[PDB]
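Reviewers asked in the last cycle whether our approach scales beyond single polypeptides. To address this, we selected a multi-component target totalling 1391 residues and predicted its structure end to end. The input consisted of the following lines:
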Amino acid sequence: GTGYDLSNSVFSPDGRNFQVEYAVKAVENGTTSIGIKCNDGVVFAVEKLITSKLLVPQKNVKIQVVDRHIGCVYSGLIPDGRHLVNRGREEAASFKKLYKTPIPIPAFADRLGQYVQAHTLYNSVRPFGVSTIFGGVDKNGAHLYMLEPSGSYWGYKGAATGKGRQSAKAELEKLVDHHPEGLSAREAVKQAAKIIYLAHEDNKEKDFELEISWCSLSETNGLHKFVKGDLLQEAIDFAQKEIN
Amino acid sequence: GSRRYDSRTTIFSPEGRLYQVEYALESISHAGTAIGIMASDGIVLAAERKVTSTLLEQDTSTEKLYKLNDKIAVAVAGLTADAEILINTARIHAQNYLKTYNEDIPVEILVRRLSDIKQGYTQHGGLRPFGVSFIYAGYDDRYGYQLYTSNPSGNYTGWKAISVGANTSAAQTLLQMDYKDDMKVDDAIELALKTLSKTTDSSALTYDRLEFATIRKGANDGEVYQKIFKPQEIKDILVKTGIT
Amino acid sequence: MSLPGSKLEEARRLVNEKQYNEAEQVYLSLLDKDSSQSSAAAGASVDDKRRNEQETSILELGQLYVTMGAKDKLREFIPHSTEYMMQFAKSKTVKVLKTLIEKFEQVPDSLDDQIFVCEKSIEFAKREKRVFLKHSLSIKLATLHYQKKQYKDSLALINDLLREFKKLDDKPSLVDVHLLESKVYHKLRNLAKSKASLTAARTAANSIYCPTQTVAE
Amino acid sequence: LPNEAGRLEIFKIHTAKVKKTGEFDFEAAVKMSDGFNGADIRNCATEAGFFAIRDDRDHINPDDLMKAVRKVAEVKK
Amino acid sequence: DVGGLDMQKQEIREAVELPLVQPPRGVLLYGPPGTGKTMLVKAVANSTKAAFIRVNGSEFVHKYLGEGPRMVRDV
Amino acid sequence: AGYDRHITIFSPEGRLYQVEYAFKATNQTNINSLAVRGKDCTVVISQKKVPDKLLDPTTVSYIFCISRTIGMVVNGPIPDARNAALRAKAEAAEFRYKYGYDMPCDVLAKRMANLSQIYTQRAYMRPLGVILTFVSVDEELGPSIYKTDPAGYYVGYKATATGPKQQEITTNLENHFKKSKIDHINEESWEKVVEFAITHMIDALGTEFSKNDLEVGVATKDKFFTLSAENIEERLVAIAEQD
Amino acid sequence: MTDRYSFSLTTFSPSGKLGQIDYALTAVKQGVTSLGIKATNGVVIATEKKSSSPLAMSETLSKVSLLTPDIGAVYSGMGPDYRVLVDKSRKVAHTSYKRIYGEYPPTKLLVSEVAKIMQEATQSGGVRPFGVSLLIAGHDEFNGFSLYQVDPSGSYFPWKATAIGKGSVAAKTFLEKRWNDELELEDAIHIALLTLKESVEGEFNGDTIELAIIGDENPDLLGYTGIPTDKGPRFRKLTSQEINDRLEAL
Amino acid sequence: ADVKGVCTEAGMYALRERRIHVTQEDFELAVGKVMNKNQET
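The resulting structure, written as structure tokens, was:
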């Protein structure tokens, strides 16, 4: 027949859920954002699109942190991931409440993928319109994960989502080749900044703001934290030079 | 959304009808013809085993005539399965009623009991009704022998005699023709058998094609005695009709 | 010895070595020996799979019984083997019993010992429960009678076999009884009859698949 | 469709015969080259060629390439 | 030469080959053809020693709607 | 009406297309995987495909260790894989907890199959479009192979494969097994058995495989585990020798 | 989430029909032809073990399954549906009967109980009827041997013998031909072999075929000794050997 | 109608028997041959 898409849990005649696939639509539409696992740790980079001067700088913050070691960022409908994020914040809490440890990134990774996939399991459950790049330093190093409304996430040497991901995925692939060694968080900070501007070239039509956060076994000790001030401004001009 | 999938069972016809109820009734037309009669001295129960065969085992088989109590047994027009549900329930209900009052249930109470139960699906739940209607044969203190009926709608009446399943109008005609108030069971027996043989859609009316029972206060009695006839007994009385 | 292979194999060897008759001391012992379990299906020893394998001898050993004429031994034992596959499986009887006797129809036998034992086990069907293709045996018995040229015996049996096979018993067999019956008629030179029977068969034969032999016949 | 091998096979066949650097990224493209056909492989070349004429390349450079590759892996698989 | 068609082989034979000597005017082969099915014909047509005529419904497609059946008769 | 397509209810033909469509999402990930009982052991070989550098390849697996003893490989959407594995993982411990001993492999499959069977019958539940493959060395059964479908249907296997070309691999082994007449590989060392399979994997796929190319897992007595790329390559070494 | 299909999924046709059931019957008819025969001394059921691949190990799939030492079941239809019903059937038997009465229910009630389930599927929302019908044979003390046939209608009735699945019509045809009252199981066993042979297309043998009986109690199978009252299960499953043994007896 | 087929086969027999003279026996076969078909599909 037809209209298989018209209800979530339905399998398409080819066995697919177009709703999720449609949810994927706005995901791309979601603000381009990336993440990087550097040598010790991970870095989370996202463009903050400036809609207007009435927006107050730095105030509306995209990247969200789970526990204290896990940052998360997503292209898509903000309230979605937020809603999800809270659940993750719940998850780790329960996890840590039970396990006394902060949660391993992959552990944390898994739990969500279920909860997302749960929203693939019912025609009444609206899949998620977001894909979160997320991770942090954990017991064993860091990890870099981006979870799809499909309920699929993976380990990522680098990760990107939203519009400009291609420009990103380009640059990420490069740095992989530029630095199969690894990367210093600092350069991880710096390079992402360039990538973002480059990624912004798709959305170049409007001005934006740049938000980048990171989790460094070294620099944040394994905490997850924002890039701020000079170091933030550094990568900016570092990129703002390199963009030219 | 779930809405797509609801047949919306209980919704009214624009004419204020319930087609499921209508259609349930319709399947009952397809149900094996079942007849019952309240004689002066008793109540007769005869129904056609429908869809029969050689290796079909008759003796244990009862697909139609079931005993709720020793003062209440019933003939079933409809899905064998569905009734057995209600059959069991009513028994309990009666048993409860018995266990409540240490006294047998006046039949209608049990009847009306099932009546609204059917009606339960009628007015709520989005649940298909039962495709079953019943001949309610019972003896009470109050009215003595009582011959009731029910429809999936739960609407129900008393009868001096009644038929259900196929050929009802035909039977009803024959019944409403040949019946007379003072008829003795054995008359009604053959009378039904007469009506049966005639209203029989198959060639011959034969025991192996029939279920038969009676409610009678015996000659040595004070215990109004229900009896289901054995195939031979049916076959025997089958001869006594001259039907042979 | 003592082993399902060994003795049987010895009984097989002592044939391969020399003969069944030496091997019979093992063969007889096969029946006399080898198992701790199940039923006494061996006529002496109590066994299950062994007897089946003792039969494996008793097949050969039967044609060796024949090669002895201890078919005459086995003749009477053929009743016992019946009870012995009754000590195992009544159907397995019907297989092996028939098998054996047919193998005694092989390795040339007097019609008698066949008839004699057939007629035995034919009844030994009934005595057990079996109305069931004792006629098949009886067919052969009739065939024996046919080979005995007892067509009276045959046809009389046959007509029963017929009335049996007339859908009181098998149509596929009912095909073949005609064939024998036809031959019977044919040896009696009753042509239409033989024809009819063959014809009825042949037409009825088309309803199923028939033995290529039968088909060829 | 050609396997990752078959692709890489066809890759260095259809593609590399267009003038290209060794800088031009041979397997990693193939790595990102998945569910392509023989002409899709050519598209991969042809697409980078856009970037080539966009980067002024007779020899395709890895720059031209994997932009295309994803871009090739973009529209469909 | 497609093995085992006897009943069908006899059937055609029953259908045509025999009545050619001695009743149907026409016979229908049904199934996938050229499977041996069409091969039935030629094989039959071979033995038959009569003037064979193959025809294709897929042949009568000439604009000249004037001729059409004309030899379809005379053929 | 035509919603029967959309939901799980008998077609006019008595069919569940959501199920049959879920059978699509099975090979959707396009991984040809296999499982063979070795002599003492059982080995699963599968395609490990990495489309992207930016991925972590190591994070990519459809072979999941359900228990100490039981590993499982999945064919279908990774989320359902990530979903189903946990479900299984929940069972064994609880089975182990409830029943004092680790769940024998089939039981899991039998258990898991029910869920699909539930999803099969339940409407609001969609089934999962993954086919599951359960092997381990069962203390009672030694090597054992069990594969479940979205239908809740499953069976034991002398050996089995899964994927788009599963059909051919099936043939190859059938031929081989008919040739061998034996249900399991005679090879004692799964090492060989791995190489054996990879051979027949390479064979029936006509495709050579590098260390990254393959996802591999090893069912051993009391333990399931998965090989490294080295172990893979190690096997890849010797196969290059025999072949 | 939160199943909002609470509404009966199968609804009475304008013609007063339940299509899913009908389609279940359709699917049931599609089922592998499977039979049962109630003889004098007992009852036998039979079906062809279906191999969708020789790599698969047939025995690992059991279409016949004991419900009680005197009761076992078989189906024609979707294996999985049959699978879960077995457990419930097994369970409800213990719970609703044994865990009450300390024993194994008379064939009818369990059957009556089982069918109850299948009905529920037909009626309650969110669920579809099962893709099988059931040939169920059991011996009880009072009703002795009995053989039942349950549909997705949840309807059930006894048989002298019967078959379900595809060739069942042809089977039942030949069954009626063959069947008599006085058939002893072994002949009936043999009969079933004959009968199912027709429904059998590919290889016919104990490895292709699944046979079991309701027989006399089997103290060996009782797994222990010392209890006079319990002489063991009447049910048993038949070995390919025993099968192929009697397939010689064909 | 089925009767006709019987007759035809009787002749078909007889024709195959090379007979414009049909016995009863032929019919008696066609019965089956038709009741073959009658029992067939």
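The CA atoms of residues 46 and 211 of chain G lie 5 Å apart. We regard this as preliminary and will revisit it once experimental data from Aim 1 are available.
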